[PDB]
Design a protein around this nucleic acid. Structure first.
Ligand SMILES: [Cl-]
Ligand SMILES: [Mn+2]
Ligand SMILES: [Mn+2]
Length: 191
DNA sequence: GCCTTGCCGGGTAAGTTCCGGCGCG
DNA sequence: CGCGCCGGAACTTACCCGGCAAGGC
């Protein structure tokens, strides 16, 4: 669908490094936000925002992409009730993604939550149920993995992809051309 | 002999929600 | 008056990073 692949990739970034927020203000004002945060403003302006802008155009969302500079990171923000529920409903229906959307979501989740050295292949999150979904997707794709409580202080689990299948994971998932390429896989392919 | 990975602590790159506007029926 | 889109940023921690060493072959 191409739109579905970019949607699933952005959802991984959103669930990873951002969030979906339903705000209630004085009064009774409101706001609906789709957010991705990141330290690198280059990565936000050059990789994340063009993908989000394409999705905004194909969905005929009229809200604009805001890029706000925070004290510790930049924030990509779309203030759109239509886009908020578009991603929210996708999240509740995530267990039904076809293989293409699964690969794209794992791409975005690893860009957000993954070990970027690629020396080890790990994904951190406190949402164990979300990692168990990704775990069964990876197993079905032939990528062996385990889940353990990695941070006993805060309750952060880790999904460790076995290095026995590091080539399978990096080549067939992170480097798939069926959906947008992550930054480090794109630099690897183009040398 | 060394590769893999469970477990851990450091601290910052994330996340979350409040503030003030404004437009529009 | 009610509700949704802008623009900013305060405020806490959930991630990532990287070292250690048990286990396996
Ligand atoms: Cl910064
Ligand atoms: Mn996260
Ligand atoms: Mn991240």
């Amino acid at each position: 669908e191409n739109v579905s692949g970019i949607s699933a990739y952005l959802l991984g970034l959103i669930i990873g490094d951002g969030g979906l927020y339903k705000l209630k203000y004085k009064g009774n004002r409101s706001e609906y936000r789709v957010v991705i945060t990141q330290k690198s403003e280059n990565l936000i302006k050059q990789h994340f925002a063009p993908l989000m802008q394409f999705l905004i155009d194909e969905l005929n969302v009229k809200s604009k992409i805001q890029i706000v500079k925070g004290d510790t990171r930049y924030e990509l923000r779309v203030s759109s009730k239509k886009l908020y529920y578009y991603f929210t409903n996708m999240l509740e229906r995530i267990r039904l993604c076809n293989m293409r959307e699964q690969i794209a979501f794992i791409k975005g989740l690893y860009v957000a939550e993954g070990d970027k050295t690629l020396k080890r292949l790990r994904i951190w999150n406190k949402n164990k149920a979300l990692l168990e979904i990704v775990s069964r997707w990876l197993n079905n794709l032939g990528v062996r993995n385990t889940i353990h409580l990695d941070d006993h202080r805060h309750g952060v689990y880790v999904l460790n992809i076995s290095l026995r299948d590091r080539i399978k994971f990096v080549h067939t998932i992170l480097s798939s051309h069926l959906n947008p390429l992550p930054p480090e896989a794109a630099a690897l392919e183009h040398h």
